[PDB]
Design an enzyme around this catalytic site. Structure first.
Site, PDB file in Angstrom:
ATOM      1  N   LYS A  52       0.804  -1.186   0.000  1.00  0.00           N
ATOM      2  CA  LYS A  52       0.000   0.000   0.000  1.00  0.00           C
ATOM      3  C   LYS A  52       0.839   1.237   0.000  1.00  0.00           C
ATOM      4  O   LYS A  52       0.449   2.260  -0.512  1.00  0.00           O
ATOM      5  CB  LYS A  52      -0.890   0.025   1.197  1.00  0.00           C
ATOM      6  CG  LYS A  52      -2.066   0.912   0.927  1.00  0.00           C
ATOM      7  CD  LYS A  52      -3.080   0.863   2.049  1.00  0.00           C
ATOM      8  CE  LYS A  52      -4.239   1.794   1.716  1.00  0.00           C
ATOM      9  NZ  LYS A  52      -3.827   3.078   1.077  1.00  0.00           N
ATOM     10  N   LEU A  54       3.226   1.621  -1.555  1.00  0.00           N
ATOM     11  CA  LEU A  54       3.685   1.933  -2.866  1.00  0.00           C
ATOM     12  C   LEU A  54       2.659   2.779  -3.603  1.00  0.00           C
ATOM     13  O   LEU A  54       1.491   2.895  -3.209  1.00  0.00           O
ATOM     14  CB  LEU A  54       3.813   0.625  -3.612  1.00  0.00           C
ATOM     15  CG  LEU A  54       5.202   0.125  -3.934  1.00  0.00           C
ATOM     16  CD1 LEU A  54       6.258   0.924  -3.221  1.00  0.00           C
ATOM     17  CD2 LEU A  54       5.262  -1.312  -3.458  1.00  0.00           C
ATOM     18  N   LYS A  64      -6.476  -7.167  -1.450  1.00  0.00           N
ATOM     19  CA  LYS A  64      -6.329  -8.361  -2.229  1.00  0.00           C
ATOM     20  C   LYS A  64      -5.044  -9.051  -1.927  1.00  0.00           C
ATOM     21  O   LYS A  64      -4.984 -10.253  -1.744  1.00  0.00           O
ATOM     22  CB  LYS A  64      -6.606  -8.075  -3.709  1.00  0.00           C
ATOM     23  CG  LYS A  64      -8.065  -8.311  -4.070  1.00  0.00           C
ATOM     24  CD  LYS A  64      -8.675  -7.324  -5.039  1.00  0.00           C
ATOM     25  CE  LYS A  64      -9.607  -6.298  -4.367  1.00  0.00           C
ATOM     26  NZ  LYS A  64     -10.238  -5.350  -5.313  1.00  0.00           N
ATOM     27  N   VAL A  95      -9.733 -16.559 -31.551  1.00  0.00           N
ATOM     28  CA  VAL A  95      -9.862 -16.575 -32.978  1.00  0.00           C
ATOM     29  C   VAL A  95      -9.342 -15.290 -33.575  1.00  0.00           C
ATOM     30  O   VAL A  95      -9.644 -14.217 -33.095  1.00  0.00           O
ATOM     31  CB  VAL A  95     -11.295 -16.773 -33.427  1.00  0.00           C
ATOM     32  CG1 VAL A  95     -11.267 -16.772 -34.959  1.00  0.00           C
ATOM     33  CG2 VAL A  95     -11.795 -18.117 -32.904  1.00  0.00           C
ATOM     34  N   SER A 172      12.032 -12.665 -34.541  1.00  0.00           N
ATOM     35  CA  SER A 172      12.910 -13.552 -33.815  1.00  0.00           C
ATOM     36  C   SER A 172      13.639 -14.423 -34.810  1.00  0.00           C
ATOM     37  O   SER A 172      14.781 -14.824 -34.583  1.00  0.00           O
ATOM     38  CB  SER A 172      12.073 -14.404 -32.902  1.00  0.00           C
ATOM     39  OG  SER A 172      10.870 -14.666 -33.606  1.00  0.00           O
ATOM     40  N   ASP A 248       2.660 -11.195 -42.950  1.00  0.00           N
ATOM     41  CA  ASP A 248       2.502  -9.768 -43.181  1.00  0.00           C
ATOM     42  C   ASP A 248       3.618  -9.225 -43.972  1.00  0.00           C
ATOM     43  O   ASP A 248       4.767  -9.599 -43.794  1.00  0.00           O
ATOM     44  CB  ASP A 248       2.359  -8.946 -41.890  1.00  0.00           C
ATOM     45  CG  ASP A 248       1.286  -9.438 -40.925  1.00  0.00           C
ATOM     46  OD1 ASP A 248       0.454 -10.296 -41.172  1.00  0.00           O
ATOM     47  OD2 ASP A 248       1.352  -8.860 -39.771  1.00  0.00           O
TER      48      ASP A 248
HETATM   49 NA    NA Z   1      -8.674 -12.886 -31.504  1.00  0.00          NA
END
Ligand code: NA
Ligand code: NA
EC number: 2.7.7.7
Length: 327
Positions: A52, A54, A64, A95, A172, A248
């Site tokens: 807290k 912080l 929490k 999707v 990558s 792409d």
């Molecule tokens: Na999606």
DNA sequence: CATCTG
DNA sequence: CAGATG
């Protein structure tokens, strides 16, 4: 990095959910600076109160954290991991083409599964359709051994269309990587630059060749500078056909290729340090250019780059092979 | 950020 | 055109 891990993880589950299920962008963002800072924090967080202390950490989060530290769990987290509605949204979202927004609409209409989707193919748009059709292929990683064959084709066909095109496979893949998620090609042509007013054909022709020979199978989105599609390595001698892969292709003015190329090759980490160093060295760098930093606070004027070399040189640095661009 | 949808 | 997706 492992000291406040669970905490940072829980906060992340929480944040995601606010945003994807609820609409809670505020809350959502809330959880995020929180994880960010607890993540940076140097000690083992032993209580809410401590946290807290912080910034970003308020009372609700502190709360929490307490329960999580108190018991290896969080009720709320537990409640959400069950909830079918929440789950559906995390799933539909997988999707290509379905973001949270759409995920909510469909769920409220009762579509919660792949099957649901197929039955209702009418309600989905072109992208979404494709996304559904290749759900599996899309989730499969791309092994370099394939990657090389892809690159092999792409580069060859481009060359054929015009000897002057310059294509590069970033990602990558370029830094070593044994597998990748998708194919990213950076493209330019001498006859295309910063000032030069357009040249759409520049990108359309290549796309077209790629389809001609059947490497590109579908179009997700085709603009005048960025193409988003699906491609596939021709199944050899029938028994083993390849998965459908995302790909792409983007046109870039030649006057800012390498910065692009640099940039896209990563890693994020490499960039950052490179970026930060540039700054020291009295320079600016972004996706498109490197600029000499004035003292008045800032300033500009695009430095001229003929290769990824020119760049390092500028910030006076060790030319890094892409493999070692790691961090 | 660029493209699409409606 | 706002709003969505990548
Ligand atoms: Na999606
Ligand atoms: Na608004």
């Amino acid at each position: 990095e492992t000291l406040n891990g669970g905490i940072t993880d829980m906060l992340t589950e929480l944040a995601n959910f606010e945003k994807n299920v609820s609409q809670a962008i505020h809350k959502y963002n809330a959880y995020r600076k929180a994880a960010s800072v607890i993540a940076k924090y140097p000690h083992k967080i032993k209580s809410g109160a401590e946290a807290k202390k912080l910034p970003g950490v308020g009372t609700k989060i502190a709360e929490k954290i307490d329960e999580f530290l108190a018991t290896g769990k969080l009720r709320k987290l537990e409640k959400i991991r069950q909830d079918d509605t929440s789950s559906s949204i995390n799933f539909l979202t997988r999707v290509s083409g379905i973001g949270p927004s759409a995920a909510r609409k469909f769920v409220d209409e009762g579509i919660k599964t792949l099957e649901d989707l197929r039955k209702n193919e009418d309600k989905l748009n072109h992208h979404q359709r494709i996304g559904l059709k290749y759900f599996g292929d899309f989730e499969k990683r791309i092994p370099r051994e394939e990657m090389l064959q892809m690159q092999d084709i792409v580069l060859n066909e481009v060359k054929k269309v015009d000897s002057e095109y310059i294509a590069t496979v970033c990602g990558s893949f370029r830094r070593g990587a044994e597998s990748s998620g998708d194919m990213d090609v950076l493209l330019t042509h001498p006859s295309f630059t910063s000032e030069s007013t357009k040249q759409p054909k520049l990108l359309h022709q290549v796309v077209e060749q790629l389809q001609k020979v059947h490497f590109i199978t579908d179009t997700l989105s085709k603009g005048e500078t960025k193409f988003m599609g699906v491609c596939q390595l021709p199944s050899k001698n029938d028994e083993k056909e390849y998965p459908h892969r995302r790909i792409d292709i983007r046109l870039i003015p030649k006057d800012q290729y390498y910065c692009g190329v640099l940039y896209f090759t990563g890693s994020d980490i490499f960039n950052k340090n490179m970026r930060a160093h540039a700054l020291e060295k009295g320079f600016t760098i972004n996706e498109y250019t490197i600029r000499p930093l004035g003292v008045t606070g800032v300033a500009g004027e695009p430095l001229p780059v003929d290769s990824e070399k020119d760049i390092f040189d500028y910030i006076q640095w060790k030319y890094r092979e892409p493999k070692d661009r790691s961090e």
